[PDB]
Design a protein around this ligand. Sequence first.
Ligand SMILES: O=C(O)[C@@H](COP(=O)(O)O)OP(=O)(O)O
Ligand SMILES: O=C(O)[C@@H](COP(=O)(O)O)OP(=O)(O)O
Ligand SMILES: [NH3+]C1CCCCC1
Lengths: 255, 254
Amino acid sequence: SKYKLIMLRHGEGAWNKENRFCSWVDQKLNSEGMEEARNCGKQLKALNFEFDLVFTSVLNRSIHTAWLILEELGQEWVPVESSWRLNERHYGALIGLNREQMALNHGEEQVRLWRRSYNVTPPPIEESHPYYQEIYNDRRYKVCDVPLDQLPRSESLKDVLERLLPYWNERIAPEVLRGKTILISAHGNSSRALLKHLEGISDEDIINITLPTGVPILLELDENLRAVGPHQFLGDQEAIQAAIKKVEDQGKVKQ
Amino acid sequence: SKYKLIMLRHGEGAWNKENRFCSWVDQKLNSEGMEEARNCGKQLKALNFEFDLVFTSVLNRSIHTAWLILEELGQEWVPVESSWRLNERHYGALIGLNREQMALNHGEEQVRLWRRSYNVTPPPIEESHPYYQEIYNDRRYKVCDVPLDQLPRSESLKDVLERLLPYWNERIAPEVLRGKTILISAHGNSSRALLKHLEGISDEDIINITLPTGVPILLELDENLRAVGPHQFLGDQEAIQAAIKKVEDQGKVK
Ligand SMILES: O=C(O)[C@@H](COP(=O)(O)O)OP(=O)(O)O
Ligand SMILES: O=C(O)[C@@H](COP(=O)(O)O)OP(=O)(O)O
Ligand SMILES: [NH3+]C1CCCCC1
């Protein structure tokens, strides 16, 4: 048999609009992002989606995106589970910095490696960093399945998959195999990590995969829980490609 | 007290304002109710509440109230569990009717009896009722711990307690005993049912308990999960008492 699930990157937030690496900083959705989430809900309603379970990260932007989708569907009663293992990749010291500024300071090539490569690790975030305290002082990280002191201070995409894969295999995949309809409301890089795994994308090719905010990602899996075909974006393809280009351009120098 | 928990009636919804028995009809919060929910969250934040688990009914007004509270607290990551066992009392055939109109036609005393009695069971809702279909055809009732055909068609407050108690005993009580800080976002009568149990209120006295929408209720329990004192509405008692009077007056002609 085959199974289909829906995954997506949270709706736009101020940091996305202002082009600043946000990562573990708990930014909220902005007005545009709330609309993106509601539109996702409307598309899923048009398709008559009936979710059984929803998985999100512990960053509120992914939770609110899910709540808006459920409201549009009239499915607010559907169980939601949130885990740090679906949190966006930890950008370390790059958190708070402007992506274009980094391109000007370090070059487009280096920024592309930091953003999309599989093995490159961002410099770790230090206690002196402006956003260190608010991240590690938050109670949500005192009750994780990993001690506060053991949580990452920066992550390569590979590091992300290493802490996300166990969650997928142990808590999400079993439900998929039970024929349940699942929604994964997450982030750009945590979603890219899962897609790399499910689609068998090489360490080299994953660098060219970019996900825009607020666009449902359709993925079909076979009996072995591997992608039957490439992931697909739901909606106007021209608009979606334009949004993808916008994300890519965040790390480029004006021309 | 050894333990403390917070419970509350969801924020104002369209039918609360229209003064119609809503019960299992899934009406949403209105602008006023959203504000009530947010003020609840602000009041709880002012008192340092840090929830570990949230329990709600499967009616969206209770869920949305919880979501707004969690947002105000910056605690959207806190686990939420929902169950039909926390659903508002099933008003049966009375669903959809205007409370004041009923008082005018049958007498204030009659309406008060239907609304607050512990033992009186409303007439069952039938297939000919305007809101029967949307209730029993909803998918949320196809995945309950009891078959769709077994779900109630009307309930007395006693009936409510009988189906709510198992959920309290099996799922909520154990968490409170572990020392977790719990939030229960429910309804007017389902909350009255739980208060009757926790405070050991008599069948006679429970009739005088009326709960206002969107007001946090603090319950202090001992080692045996018994209330050490009467429930405490958190906030200005004058305004809260006024909101309670508002609910009572829904069944009065004037
Ligand atoms: O970490 C972040 O700032 C973004 C991704 O940024 P880029 O890797 O795409 O630059 O995560 P998201 O907006 O999905 O929560
Ligand atoms: O069933 C309803 O309409 C109300 C209670 O109405 P009364 O018993 O006070 O008339 O419950 P709610 O969902 O608003 O908390
Ligand atoms: N001072 C900055 C150098 C580039 C990586 C992020 C920190």
